[PDB]
Amino acid sequence: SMSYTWTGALITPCAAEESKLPINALSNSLLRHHNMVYATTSRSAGLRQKKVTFDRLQVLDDHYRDVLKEMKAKASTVKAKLLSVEEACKLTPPHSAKSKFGYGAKDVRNLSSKAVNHIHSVWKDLLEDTVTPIDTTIMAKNEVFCVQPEKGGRKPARLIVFPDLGVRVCEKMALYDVVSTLPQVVMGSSYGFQYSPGQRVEFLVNTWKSKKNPMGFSYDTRCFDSTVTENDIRVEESIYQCCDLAPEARQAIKSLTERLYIGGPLTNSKGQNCGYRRCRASGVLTTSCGNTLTCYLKASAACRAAKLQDCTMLVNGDDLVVICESAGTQEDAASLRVFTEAMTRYSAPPGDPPQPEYDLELITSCSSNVSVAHDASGKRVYYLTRDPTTPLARAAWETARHTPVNSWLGNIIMYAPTLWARMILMTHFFSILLAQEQLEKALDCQIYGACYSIEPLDLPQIIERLHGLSAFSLHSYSPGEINRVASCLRKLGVPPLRAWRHRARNVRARLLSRGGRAAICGKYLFNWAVKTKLKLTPIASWFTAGYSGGDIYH
Numbered sequence: 292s293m294s295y296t297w298t299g300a301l302i303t304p305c306a307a308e309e310s311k312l313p314i315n316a317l318s319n320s321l322l323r324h325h326n327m328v329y330a331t332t333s334r335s336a337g338l339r340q341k342k343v344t345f346d347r348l349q350v351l352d353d354h355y356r357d358v359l360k361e362m363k364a365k366a367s368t369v370k371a372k373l374l375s376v377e378e379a380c381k382l383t384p385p386h387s388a389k390s391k392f393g394y395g396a397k398d399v400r401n402l403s404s405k406a407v408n409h410i411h412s413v414w415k416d417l418l419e420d421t422v423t424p425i426d427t428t429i430m431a432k433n434e435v436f437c438v439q440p441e442k443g444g445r446k447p448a449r450l451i452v453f454p455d456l457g458v459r460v461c462e463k464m465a466l467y468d469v470v471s472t473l474p475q476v477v478m479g480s481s482y483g484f485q486y487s488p489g490q491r492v493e494f495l496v497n498t499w500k501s502k503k504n505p506m507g508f509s510y511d512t513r514c515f516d517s518t519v520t521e522n523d524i525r526v527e528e529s530i531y532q533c534c535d536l537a538p539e540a541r542q543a544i545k546s547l548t549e550r551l552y553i554g555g556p557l558t559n560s561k562g563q564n565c566g567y568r569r570c571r572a573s574g575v576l577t578t579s580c581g582n583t584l585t586c587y588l589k590a591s592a593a594c595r596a597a598k599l600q601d602c603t604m605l606v607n608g609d610d611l612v613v614i615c616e617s618a619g620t621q622e623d624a625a626s627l628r629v630f631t632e633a634m635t636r637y638s639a640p641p642g643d644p645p646q647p648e649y650d651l652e653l654i655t656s657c658s659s660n661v662s663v664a665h666d667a668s669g670k671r672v673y674y675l676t677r678d679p680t681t682p683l684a685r686a687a688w689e690t691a692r693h694t695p696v697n698s699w700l701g702n703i704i705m706y707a708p709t710l711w712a713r714m715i716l717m718t719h720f721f722s723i724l725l726a727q728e729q730l731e732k733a734l735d736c737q738i739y740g741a742c743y744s745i746e747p748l749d750l751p752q753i754i755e756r757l758h759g760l761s762a763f764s765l766h767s768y769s770p771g772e773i774n775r776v777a778s779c780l781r782k783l784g785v786p787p788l789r790a791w792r793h794r795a796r797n798v799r800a801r802l803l804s805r806g807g808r809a810a811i812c813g814k815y816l817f818n819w820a821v822k823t824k825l826k827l828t829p830i831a832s833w834f835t836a837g838y839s840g841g842d843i844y845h
């Protein structure tokens with residue numbers, strides 16, 4: 292069936308959309324080429340609609356059925372419970388999209404009688420009606436990127452589809468415990484959201500070292516959400532139903548699946564009918580869990596079809612990486628074409644064809660690649676990094692414009708061991724926080740899809756836990772990494788790393804002169820900036836599951 296059917300009505304914005312980086316002294320000091328930074332808007336929605344709209348002709352075989360049978364067996368050992376309205380309300384983000392029935396996120400969090408009444412009303416309706424399609428709102432996402440001349444064009448806006456606030460609260464009650472506990476049990480070590488950054492790089496390295504003749508490859512599915520069929524979503528439900536569940540939970544899950552997840556009508560911000568969806572909605576609670584389960588199922592089946600030896604997969608929604616035993620270059624290449632053929636039959640063709648890689652560092656999965664550096668003692672340390680272009684473009688944007696999004700803090704947290712996050716991001720932002728006396732201001736930031744409120748002053752502690760103490764002592768970065776960073780800075784017009792060392796020394800001194808956590812930040816985060824090193828001793832729920840698009844607040 293067609294992933295989407297459109298009426299003609301346009302995907303419209305709900306408010307003014309900023310698209311260009313303003314000339315701002317603060318952002319200019321970080322990146323001079325402001326014209327290269329842009330934010331996607333609803334104006335490119337049509338280009339995205341065109342790409343995500345196509346016919347899926349899914350054909351399933353025995354390998355697929357065998358894997359599914361094995362997954363359900365594991366799911367049978369899981370027990371999940373319903374969440375109380377109170378529990379679901381507390382998981383709702385403070386600035387979550389308000390309901391169309393006279394109440395908003397604040398009313399929900401506060402448990403206002405009106406919000407609570409509508410929620411119960413929606414829940415009861417889910418139990419009584421398991422057929423009538425639930426309405427959803429389709430919008431174009433506003434995300435920031437840097438122009439890529441080689442790509443021959445700007446990135447079109449991504450589309451987000453989500454149901455009313457009342458429905459989202461019900462989703463939580465019916466499936467939050469399921470999507471938070473089931474994945475790990477069914478996919479074991481392959482489930483990527485159970486790992487902190489340090490555990491992830493450890494799993495990748497250990498997995499690679501466990502093979503005799505290692506070969507790995509990432510598989511990029513073209514428009515994954517669009518490739519997810521009604522049957523995929525129903526197979527997903529059958530997996531949830533294998534759990535030990537409460538009677539109305541089963542009914543709620545059946546109802547949500549039939550009325551929302553398998554598809555439904557699309558409505559723009561103006562209230563007009565844009566069409567119908569028959570694929571995955573990017574903006575529901577089960578998006579992450581469902582995509583991960585589906586990707587895992589198809590990929591596992593495809594590994595068997597391709598006859599790959601001693602395969603180990605790591606999955607995070609639609610992001611997939613496989614590490615196995617090589618059979619030779621010509622044979623590996625042929626095996627991958629077979630793997631791709633199977634995925635295509637399962638309704639999951641590739642964007643870029645997968646390529647066998649024989650060097651772990653050359654594999655990009657979850658937009659990251661493993662790299663190596665050395666700690667104070669010269670000991671080899673593996674860590675995850677990535678081209679810093681997008682992070683820096685977003686950092687410049689967030690410096691110039693008041694955005695409720697703080698991707699820069701997420702980047703420092705997740706990529707703390709990198710030379711770019713340490714020398715550039717930490718330096719630039721702590722300088723700003725000092726000038727504005729905002730060191731104590733808590734900022735919201737997404738981690739594995741969930742929203743957390745984080746204090747920048749708690750970074751040292753957070754980093755030690757997520758990466759280990761070595762994150763504050765890494766040096767002797769690989770030639771490849773150093774070159775990628777340097778090339779990125781030239782492209783964006785970002786001051787060279789040496790210019791950052793000077794700034795960091797000044798910032799470090801200012802932090803040390805301040806009290807408590809501030810001095811700890813100066814000592815641990817900027818020890819790299821001084822020759823006379825200080826002694827870095829141990830400083831005196833984030834990685835359990837994925838929730839991208841799930842409207843979750845922790």
Ligand SMILES: *[C@H](/C(C)=C/c1ccccc1)[C@H]1SC(=S)N(NS(=O)(=O)c2ccccc2)C1=O
Pocket residue numbers: 483487488491607610656657658659675701702705706737738739740837838839
């Ligand atoms: C990829 C991913 C899991 C990246 C990763 C993990 C650990 C260390 C470094 C990178 C996808 S899946 C997902 S949800 N992501 N958002 S995140 O919150 O995990 C994140 C935020 C900022 C920087 C890296 C990851 C991913 O990025």
